[PDB]
């Protein structure tokens, strides 16, 4: 009998508390354009911290750093200068779209409270607040006074996820970002076509169409993953297979560079380093010249 829309509407109406709009005047400089930039800057920091753990050779709050660590997205390493190392889930997280990344962090946030509850704000209270936020209007100011004490205690973790914006000047108002409004919506991709090349010759990529799967298979040891995702390792055999298809090392390097991950390019450009690892790029050319 009941569909997805029926169960959602039932869970949303289940709790009588809803978003009260602030009767107080709104600062003109807090527009939909500002809130989009704010939410973007919050997530760019989270993503930069994840990109920081990628092997080569001022950060988000403890509320974010710990959830990524406990969520096995980034493992603790006692050898690195940064003291952290990226996992398989970490690279998957990087290729995920904006909405999916928020739900990775949200579901882990819900999981952390129940684990702290079992050892002794619970899941029911947290979910109900997320359900309310999804029904809010983007750009509109809402009364913080109207929120319950438990819901008020959730705001610092929710601002850390770039879902809510509370001005330093007026704590009486809370602004939901585009991430809050569109949270449970859809009832122009961000990382489709991207390729991630590691220092250990490993590949992580989200193919645009099966044409890219066929293209990557010419020079990489592929293995199909969920949706358009593919994973593999660059070997002498795979690189020399490309030679038999008329693909040169120069064409391989130029393809991996042009199709590189947005955030990984950003971190490389901000430092004094090229996107693709130089050690790998030299080995791509060597294998193509290693013939008889």
Numbering used by the authors: 109 to 165, 176 to 238, 254 to 320, 331 to 435
The authors write:
XPB is part of the general transcription factor IIH (TFIIH), which is functionally divided into core TFIIH and the CAK complex. Analogous to the stimulation of XPD’s helicase activity by p44, the enzymatic activity of XPB is also regulated by its binding partner p52 (6). We pursued the structural characterization of p52 from the fungal model organism Chaetomium thermophilum (ctp52) using x-ray crystallography. The model shows that ctp52 is organized into four distinct domains, an N-terminal domain (NTD; aa 1–120), two middle domains (MD1; aa 121–319 and MD2; aa 350–454), and a C-terminal domain (CTD; aa 455–514), that interacts with p8 (40).
The second structure encompasses the C-terminal part starting at amino acid 121 (ctp52_121–514) and was solved in complex with ctp8 at a resolution of 2.7 Å. In the latter structure a 28 amino acid long linker region of ctp52 (amino acids (aa) 322–349), that is not present in human p52, was replaced by a short linker (sequence SNGNG). The linker region that was replaced in ctp52_121–514, bridges MD1 with MD2 and could not be observed in our structure due to its flexibility. The ctp52_1–321 model comprises the NTD and MD1 domains and the ctp52_121–514 model the MD1, MD2, and CTD domains. A superposition of the ctp52/ctp8 structure with the cryo-EM model of human p52/p8 within TFIIH shows that the MD2 domain was found to be oriented differently compared to our model. While the antiparallel β-sheet of MD2 (β-strands 8–11) is pointing towards MD1 and is involved in the formation of the dimer interface in our ctp52_121–514/ctp8 structure, it is pointing towards the N-terminal extension (NTE) of XPB in the TFIIH model. This is most likely due to the different conditions and interactions in the crystallization experiments compared to the cryo-EM experiment. However, after the rearrangement of the individual ctp52 domains according to the model of human p52/p8 embedded in TFIIH an overall rsmd of 1.6 Å was obtained, indicating a high degree of structural similarity. Our crystal structures of ctp52 show that p52 is a flexible protein that requires its binding partners XPB and p8 to assume a complete functional state. We cannot exclude the possibility that the domain arrangement observed in our crystal structure is a crystallization artefact due to crystal packing.
